[PDB]
Amino acid sequence: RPKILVENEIGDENYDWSHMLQIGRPLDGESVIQRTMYLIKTKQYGDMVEAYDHARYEFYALRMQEETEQQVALEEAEMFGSLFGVSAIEHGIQKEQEVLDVWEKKVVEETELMAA
Amino acid sequence: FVSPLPKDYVFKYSNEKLNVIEACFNLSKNGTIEDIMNNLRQYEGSAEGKAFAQEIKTKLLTKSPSSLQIALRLVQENSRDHIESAIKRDLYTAANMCMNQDSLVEFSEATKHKLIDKQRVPYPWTKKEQLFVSQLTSITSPKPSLPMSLLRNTSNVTWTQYPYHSKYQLPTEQEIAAYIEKRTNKVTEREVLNHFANVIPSRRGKLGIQSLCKIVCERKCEE
Amino acid sequence: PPVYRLPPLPRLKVKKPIIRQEANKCLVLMSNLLQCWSSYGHMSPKCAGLVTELKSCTSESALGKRKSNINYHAARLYDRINGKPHD
Amino acid sequence: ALEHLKEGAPLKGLFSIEGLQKAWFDRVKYLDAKLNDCTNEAQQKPLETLIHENSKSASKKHIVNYASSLYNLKFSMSSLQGCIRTPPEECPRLGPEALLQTPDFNRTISNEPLTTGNERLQAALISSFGSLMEFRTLLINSNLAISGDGFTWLVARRQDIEYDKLFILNTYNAGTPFNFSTSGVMNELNNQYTNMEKQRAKQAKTKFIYETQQKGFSGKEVSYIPLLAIDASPKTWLTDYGVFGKREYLERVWDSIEWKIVESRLPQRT
Amino acid sequence: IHVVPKLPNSKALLQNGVPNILSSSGFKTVWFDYQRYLCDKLTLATAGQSLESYYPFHILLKTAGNPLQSNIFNLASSIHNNHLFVENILPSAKTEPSRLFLSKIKDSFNGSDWEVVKEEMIYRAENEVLGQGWLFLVENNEKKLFILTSNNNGTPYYFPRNQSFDLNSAISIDEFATLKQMKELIGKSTKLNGKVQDWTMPIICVNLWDHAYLHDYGVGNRSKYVKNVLDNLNWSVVNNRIFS
Amino acid sequence: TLAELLGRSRIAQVANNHKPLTYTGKKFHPTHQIIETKPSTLYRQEWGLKSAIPSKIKSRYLVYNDLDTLERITTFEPRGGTQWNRLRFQEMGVPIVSNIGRQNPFFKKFNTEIIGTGGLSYSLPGKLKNSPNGVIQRTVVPGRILNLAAIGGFVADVVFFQSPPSSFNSMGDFIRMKTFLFEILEASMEKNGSVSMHARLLE
Amino acid sequence: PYPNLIPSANDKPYSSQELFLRQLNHSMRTAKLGATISKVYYPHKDIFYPPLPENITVESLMSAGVHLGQSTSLWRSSTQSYIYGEYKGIHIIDLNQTLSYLKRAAKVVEGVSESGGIILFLGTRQGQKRGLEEAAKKTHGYYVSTRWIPGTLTNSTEISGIWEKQEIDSNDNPTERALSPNETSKQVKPDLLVVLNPTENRNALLEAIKSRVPTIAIIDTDSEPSLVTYPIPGNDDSLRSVNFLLGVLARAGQRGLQNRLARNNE
Ligand SMILES: [Mg+2]
Numbered sequence A: 001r002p003k004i005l006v007e008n009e010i011g012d013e014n015y016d017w018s019h020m021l022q023i024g025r026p027l028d029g030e031s032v033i034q035r036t037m038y039l040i041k042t043k044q045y046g047d048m049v050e051a052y053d054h055a056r057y058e059f060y061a062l063r064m065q066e067e068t069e070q071q072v073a074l075e076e077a078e079m080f081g082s083l084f085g086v087s088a089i090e091h092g093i094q095k096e097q098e099v100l101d102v103w104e105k106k107v108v109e110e111t112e113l114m115a116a
Numbered sequence B: 001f002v003s004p005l006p007k008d009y010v011f012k013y014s015n016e017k018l019n020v021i022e023a024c025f026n027l028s029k030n031g032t033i034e035d036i037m038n039n040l041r042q043y044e045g046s047a048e049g050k051a052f053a054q055e056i057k058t059k060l061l062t063k064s065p066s067s068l069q070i071a072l073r074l075v076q077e078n079s080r081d082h083i084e085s086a087i088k089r090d091l092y093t094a095a096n097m098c099m100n101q102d103s104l105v106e107f108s109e110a111t112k113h114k115l116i117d118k119q120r121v122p123y124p125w126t127k128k129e130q131l132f133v134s135q136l137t138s139i140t141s142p143k144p145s146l147p148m149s150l151l152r153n154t155s156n157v158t159w160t161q162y163p164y165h166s167k168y169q170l171p172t173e174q175e176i177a178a179y180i181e182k183r184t185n186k187v188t189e190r191e192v193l194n195h196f197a198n199v200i201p202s203r204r205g206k207l208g209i210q211s212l213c214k215i216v217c218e219r220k221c222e223e
Numbered sequence C: 001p002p003v004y005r006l007p008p009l010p011r012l013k014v015k016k017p018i019i020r021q022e023a024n025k026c027l028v029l030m031s032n033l034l035q036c037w038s039s040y041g042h043m044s045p046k047c048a049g050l051v052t053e054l055k056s057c058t059s060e061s062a063l064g065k066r067k068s069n070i071n072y073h074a075a076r077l078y079d080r081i082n083g084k085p086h087d
Numbered sequence D: 001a002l003e004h005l006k007e008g009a010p011l012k013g014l015f016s017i018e019g020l021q022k023a024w025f026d027r028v029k030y031l032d033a034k035l036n037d038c039t040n041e042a043q044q045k046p047l048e049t050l051i052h053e054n055s056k057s058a059s060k061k062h063i064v065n066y067a068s069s070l071y072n073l074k075f076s077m078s079s080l081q082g083c084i085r086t087p088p089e090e091c092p093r094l095g096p097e098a099l100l101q102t103p104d105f106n107r108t109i110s111n112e113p114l115t116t117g118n119e120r121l122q123a124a125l126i127s128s129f130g131s132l133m134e135f136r137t138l139l140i141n142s143n144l145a146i147s148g149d150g151f152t153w154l155v156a157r158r159q160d161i162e163y164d165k166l167f168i169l170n171t172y173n174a175g176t177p178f179n180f181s182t183s184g185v186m187n188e189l190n191n192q193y194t195n196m197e198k199q200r201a202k203q204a205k206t207k208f209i210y211e212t213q214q215k216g217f218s219g220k221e222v223s224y225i226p227l228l229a230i231d232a233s234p235k236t237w238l239t240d241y242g243v244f245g246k247r248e249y250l251e252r253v254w255d256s257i258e259w260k261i262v263e264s265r266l267p268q269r270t
Numbered sequence E: 001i002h003v004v005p006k007l008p009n010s011k012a013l014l015q016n017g018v019p020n021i022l023s024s025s026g027f028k029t030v031w032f033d034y035q036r037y038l039c040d041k042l043t044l045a046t047a048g049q050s051l052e053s054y055y056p057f058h059i060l061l062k063t064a065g066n067p068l069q070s071n072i073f074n075l076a077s078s079i080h081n082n083h084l085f086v087e088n089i090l091p092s093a094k095t096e097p098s099r100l101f102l103s104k105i106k107d108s109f110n111g112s113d114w115e116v117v118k119e120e121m122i123y124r125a126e127n128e129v130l131g132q133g134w135l136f137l138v139e140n141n142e143k144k145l146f147i148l149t150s151n152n153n154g155t156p157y158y159f160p161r162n163q164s165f166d167l168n169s170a171i172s173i174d175e176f177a178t179l180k181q182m183k184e185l186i187g188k189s190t191k192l193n194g195k196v197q198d199w200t201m202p203i204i205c206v207n208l209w210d211h212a213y214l215h216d217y218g219v220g221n222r223s224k225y226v227k228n229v230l231d232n233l234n235w236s237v238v239n240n241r242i243f244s
Numbered sequence F: 001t002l003a004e005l006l007g008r009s010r011i012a013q014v015a016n017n018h019k020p021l022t023y024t025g026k027k028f029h030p031t032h033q034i035i036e037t038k039p040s041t042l043y044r045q046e047w048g049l050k051s052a053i054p055s056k057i058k059s060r061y062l063v064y065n066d067l068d069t070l071e072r073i074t075t076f077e078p079r080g081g082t083q084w085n086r087l088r089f090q091e092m093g094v095p096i097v098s099n100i101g102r103q104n105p106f107f108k109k110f111n112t113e114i115i116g117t118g119g120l121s122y123s124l125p126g127k128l129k130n131s132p133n134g135v136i137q138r139t140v141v142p143g144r145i146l147n148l149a150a151i152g153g154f155v156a157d158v159v160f161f162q163s164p165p166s167s168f169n170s171m172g173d174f175i176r177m178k179t180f181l182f183e184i185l186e187a188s189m190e191k192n193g194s195v196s197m198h199a200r201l202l203e
Numbered sequence G: 001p002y003p004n005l006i007p008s009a010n011d012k013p014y015s016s017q018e019l020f021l022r023q024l025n026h027s028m029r030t031a032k033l034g035a036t037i038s039k040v041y042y043p044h045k046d047i048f049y050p051p052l053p054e055n056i057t058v059e060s061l062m063s064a065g066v067h068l069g070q071s072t073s074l075w076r077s078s079t080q081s082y083i084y085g086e087y088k089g090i091h092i093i094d095l096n097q098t099l100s101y102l103k104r105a106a107k108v109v110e111g112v113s114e115s116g117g118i119i120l121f122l123g124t125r126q127g128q129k130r131g132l133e134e135a136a137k138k139t140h141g142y143y144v145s146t147r148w149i150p151g152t153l154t155n156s157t158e159i160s161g162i163w164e165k166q167e168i169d170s171n172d173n174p175t176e177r178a179l180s181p182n183e184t185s186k187q188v189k190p191d192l193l194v195v196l197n198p199t200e201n202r203n204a205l206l207e208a209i210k211s212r213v214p215t216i217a218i219i220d221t222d223s224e225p226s227l228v229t230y231p232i233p234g235n236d237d238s239l240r241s242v243n244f245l246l247g248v249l250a251r252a253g254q255r256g257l258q259n260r261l262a263r264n265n266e
Helices: A029-042 A048-079 A088-115 B015-025 B033-041 B047-062 B065-080 B083-098 B108-117 B133-139 B173-184 B189-199 B209-219 C025-038 C045-057 C074-081 D019-023 D025-038 D047-054 D062-079 D096-100 D119-129 D132-146 D185-199 D202-214 D234-241 D246-255 D259-265 E010-016 E024-045 E056-063 E070-089 E099-108 E114-127 E173-188 E210-217 E222-231 E235-240 F002-008 F039-043 F081-092 F165-170 G016-031 G043-048 G058-064 G077-082 G095-115 G129-138 G181-185 G202-211 G239-265
Strands: D150-158 D166-172 D223-231 E134-139 E145-150 E201-207 F061-066 F075-077 F140-145 F155-159 F179-189 F195-202 G083-086 G091-093 G119-122 G142-144 G192-195 G215-219 G230-233
Touching: A029 A048, A048 D132, A048 D166, A048 E070, A048 F081, A088 C025, A088 F081, A088 F140, B015 B033, B015 B047, B015 B209, B033 B047, B033 B065, B065 B083, B065 B133, B173 B189, B173 B209, B189 B209, B189 G239, C025 C045, D019 D025, D019 D234, D025 D062, D047 D062, D062 D223, D062 D259, D096 E024, D119 D132, D119 D166, D119 D259, D132 D150, D132 D166, D132 D246, D166 D223, D185 D202, D185 E173, D202 F140, D202 F179, D223 D259, D234 D246, D234 E210, E010 E024, E024 E070, E024 E210, E056 E070, E070 E201, E070 E235, E099 E114, E099 E145, E099 E235, E114 E134, E114 E145, E114 E222, E201 E222, E210 E222, F002 G058, F002 G083, F039 G043, F140 F195, F155 F179, G043 G129, G043 G239, G058 G095, G058 G239, G077 G083, G077 G095, G091 G095, G095 G119, G095 G192, G095 G215, G095 G230, G095 G239, G119 G129, G129 G142, G129 G239, G192 G202, G202 G215, G215 G239
Parallel strands: F155 F195, G119 G142, G119 G192, G192 G215, G215 G230
Antiparallel strands: D150 D166, D150 D223, E134 E145, E134 E201, F061 F075, F140 F179, F179 F195, G083 G091
């Protein structure tokens, strides 16, 4: 999952780690960890490990929800006559194809070299 | 070495509270604590501001009346007069409090109750009436019975107002008002802020100066 | 593993950067022909097209077709890539 | 049409005296009247049968859509029941903070089939989905995702009326949960288009792809027996729960499912 | 972070709604709550991505070609479309439709009247979209205008995501042929992302979602609502978004 | 304090590792955190790292080990292929389930082993996927045969009814050129974190 | 506007140029529509809208990336006082210290601008040019991106001999009279050299101190801080942190210029 490291105003943010989903921040392992730390501070889970587990479990549900959202959005798009010119897998195949073509010509030359 | 204030910072004294303070605590030549209390009682305006005024009246009541009166008597005189004389006056009144001949400033007992004995609970007080002006003067003035004198400085100098404070702090409402008057003889808020935050060389990088100026504008002037 | 740090040198450079080109087509054809002639007697028609191809290649000149900036990078980046302590 | 709900006093769990009416009684009226306007016949008959008759037809399309809309709603409402939670008229509407709340579907479980019998149904669900909680997450999250007019369907793979395996699918606007009625319509249209072009390969490959998508592991086609429907449209939940309370609504629905009906719908296993 | 824009005379709108078409509550439902919700969702989707910096319209244009991340597109589309709709609605920021606009309409629809065009639009709205959607009057690279329906979060701008008709229901032969032609055109594009050129601009967006009408007009009477909207809309805004 | 801010901040968030950027061994899952820029930030060479990154890099994504080294260069590689593999997998839509009879780990001192899947799929197995044409029973995916088949950023075991000679024997070790369709049956995940897919060749 | 636009016929469709204009119009009016995006970093905004020295915080500096010092193995121990701690195999610059030094630097920049001094912004790194030029424009000042030819101040007459000098008011009006050949040939020395990569141009620093010119520099955790008059501890490698500091300095100098103009007017 790509990570942007270019900071927006660090002073402007104000995250209540009662929950994971903050607004300016995305959902990631960081958010989990922040939640764990919050739990530790508040002493809901006195143990660190338990708090971590809890945060992980909170994350998982959110991730599952995110996954379902995208798939159903795609389904909807398919239903209502949306048209996607290049799918991700198709793109990948195309990318592979050029490389393979490059390899083939080179490989033939190498075989010829070897023969002679 | 300064730093800006946090983004959650709010100036404690709101506009309406400042206005009610201005209404109540401003007094004439012969103002009193009783007069202030009356003013607080009869103030009318915002509900929150009224509640605040009531609260401050209550806390005045809780505190001692004679000491408050003495303070009131002192402050106008000190505003009028110069530093050294004011200091001397303060010293004299402290002496009088220590050695109360007239027995009209229950101080030592109150201190014992508070500082020595116990932190909790206010003192009940055993003296509550309007002291006369001559009596007040006598309380805050010297006599030939006891000799009094401040210890001599190297710089034995006397002045009516501070030589170096006005430059190196946030500018008073009065100064802002004077500037506005000068400008008049159009004017706008942004221009005023620029003048205060940029033109004045001593107060270019003052921390919460623009905000202060804005507050002042909100309080006093109009469009 | 055992790292090997050099001392401070005057100039990091390779004395002969190889720009490993591909071998010549005409030479290859000639070698193939030679290989064919090792078998099949002196000049049988199994290598009838190969000889023709060789001739076509070596018509204008004996060889058909006629540098790596590597020590332009070493020279450039030596001062960076050093672990030379500060001044 | 239904017995368990009425015009005066709605369900204590989900809907309110006005909000229920807006959701159900008015919608149904709108649909039936529209259907009557479209078709001169006033005989209701079965809805499913009508859909089957008039499917794969652009002229007889609107009527089919209206039948689907009516049927789906009815199916959704049959499943539902009363609940323990307070009415939304008493409770406050959820604000923007509802979006940021973590869902408890991963950790908590409630109102299972087991609590009111329905053991074999529960076992079937478990077999399909791994667990009850997993099934629930699949259902509710899918419903949330729909974001528009649609329905989430618990279904059973028809190969007596035997079934192979339980499943869940979403369907939108006025889409049927039955596969056989609409299976291969697109392929047929493609074939017609190709014929027209000829009259006036890549296309062959696309057709082959379509065919393999359609056809099952053995049988000539496949169909789905619906067991549970859950509506996703704003029509129902905007009245009571506002904009932000879709998830809350879905939770409430889930709490107030009558699983006995679902169990009855579920046929015998092979 | 994406936040809702401040509308002109906001307090007045909150107090009243919109004089003719939307109530105080009904306007809040469509904008002051729903728009906010949409913005929040978009922020959640695109918090740490490169999409955070871009405006909704530009996000939609970026995303349109991607099959995955359709949720982002949907949200972005909704946000833009809804604000267009609100802009069309607003009383001020009486204005008549422009002469140029009328001439363009006449050129487009076989020399028909504006009332007739409105009637055709409302008929299209009634017939085409089931459930949710949008009703646009657009203008393309050929200067003539035309009516464009979308089925939930379909954009008027980019024709592969017009989302103009529902294949969940049965479809015509002509519609299928049109789809096939579109697909072919898309394939002809020949870029790595695979995105065609398109210059469709919306002139009158209308919001056929239930977040606008359902409070005021009930579950029926969506057509009536649409008619009301058409009758009372900001014409100055429309005029502004017309000329090249 | 500053220290607290540093601990919070986005460089501290990237968990450190000194694994090879060039690893020619078997890659079963991502090694390094992928790091993207925006286009604007790329244009002025800023990635949110210690230093500027060379203008030669035109890709928005990268991977790194050290913010700064003794050689006065950040140790990075401009590639984020692992995200695309994940996205391909998602598109394919074959839900990963443990073939061993066990509960799904996402539901309910430290264990460093991979909790279920590594997070390439949070999809649940029970769903169907409808389309205009109908409900998709068989997932159709194009892939390449190597000799095993490369199917959308994953290598997968393959099976068929009869081994086709015309396609295979015509080009024995240039089978990689021709893309063939596949029917993906199921995806299992082993202890080492390898996704063991199983496909079926269609003709 | 657009005088050479040949508009297409009414029966015909839009031309390419006409279409482009329509797109531009759409962009200006209704593209940035659906939402507004608060709290996000645009690179350009630090150059064209830098904050005043007052309003800068530690948090802003951290966001800029000013805290990230060179490396643990590339440490000049001369810079020890400035560094906060080490983390991720990198020395991290104490940022309160950075702030105070920046303020001090900003004040001196403002002062020389007020006095009407020649400020010179020196920045040899790749991306720095545009921001440097902007800063130079902001105060009526100067810059160098293409390399500093050794001896611009020490050997001024040979190097900077054949370039045009000017005259200036108490304001900044050219007052174009002819400079005499004796009047032209004298050196015109800067009153503030401000560098963005002091480690890369040691030479420039060395003549500044020979030529008796106060100098400001972004001292990283490998740079010698004693080599100039007003060091600002910070991250000189990243382009955005440098720009932020530079932009601040420019803003400080701009203010001082404005004040000077005001007092001239008075
Ligand atoms: Mg450096």
